[PDB]
Each structure stands twice: as C-alpha cells, then as structure tokens.
C-alpha cells in the first residue's frame, strides 16, 4: 500500500482545491511517495553511512537537501 | 493527516528502514506535505487558469514539473 488519496485530497483541498480526479491524486501520490521513498532511502544509507543509529530527523534533513537539486 | 508515520513507515521500510525515530518520520512528513500543498495550489491555480474545475493527473503534471521534481 501507499499514499492514500483521501489524506492527499485534503492537503490539496487545504490549498484550496475544489474538484480533483483520483488520477490527479495518484500522480501527486506517486510523486510525493517516490520522493518520500527517495529521501528515506537517502536517510537510510545515511544512517547506513553511520551503519547504525536509526532513521532520524537530521537523517531526513540531510537526506532531503541531499537528493534535491 | 500530516502524512501518518505508519504509512510513511512502510514507504521508508521500502527505503530500507528498521527502527525510525519520531523526529525522522515527522520531519519528512513535514517536508513532503509542505511540497504536496505546493503542487496543489499550483495544479489548482493551474486548473483555474484553465477556467475549469477538475484537477487531473495533468494538473499535478504541470504543477509538479513546474516546480522541479
């Protein structure tokens, strides 16, 4: 399983979206998720660059400023 | 709602996670969700710039790509 479209649809709604396809949701879903899988796996080999210290905030924070370009 | 850390759990498990820290899960969720709201009002001011109602896999497509990733 992966990014539920209901949660997202409320995010996008939170912006001020009104009427959204599930396909709009899922492309965003597959974006933000593959991004999330992106940062995380970054933050993973990050914590793995350590070798051990659990996935952590700065493990994200590094991971994010990492992959992003 | 702010990207539940369970769902992001199995995402970042897909990454390669084992034992995360709540600082981690939330920070990422704070990242991507900040982005997701971004692509929203983008895809939205997109679908409104059109003069239409329904946001699509396109509307994400232009919103997201318009950003970068």
**Element string of chain A (H = helix, E = strand):** HEHH
* Largest interface, counted by CB within 8 Å of the partner chain's CB: A-B, 49 and 44 residues
State the secondary-structure class of chain A. mainly alpha
**Any idea of the CATH class of chain A?**
Mainly Alpha
Fourth-tier CATH superfamily name of chain A: Histone, subunit A
Helix content of chain A: over 70%
User: What is the CA-atom radius of gyration of chain A, in angstroms?
Assistant: 15 Å
What is the CATH fold-level name of chain A? Answer: Histone, subunit A
Oligomer: homodimer
Sheet with the most strands of chain A? none
DSSP helical segment count of chain A? 3
PDB class: histone protein
Keywords: archaeal histone protein, DNA binding protein HMF-2, histone protein
Assembly: dimeric
Entry title: histone B from methanothermus fervidus
Verbal overview:
- Chains A, B: One of its GO terms (biological process) is DNA topological change.
- Chains A, B: Belongs to the archaeal histone HMF family.
- Chains A, B: Keywords: Chromosome, Cytoplasm, DNA-binding.
- Two copies of one chain form a homodimer.
- Chain A is mostly helical and 69 residues long.
- Chain A has helices spanning 5-15, 22-50, 57-67, and one strand spanning 19-20.
- In chain A, helix 1 (5-15) crosses helix 2 and helix 2 (22-50) packs across helix 3 (57-67).
- The interface between A and B is large, with 49 and 44 residues.
- Strand 1 (19-20) of chain A pairs parallel with strand 1 of chain B, so a sheet runs across the interface.
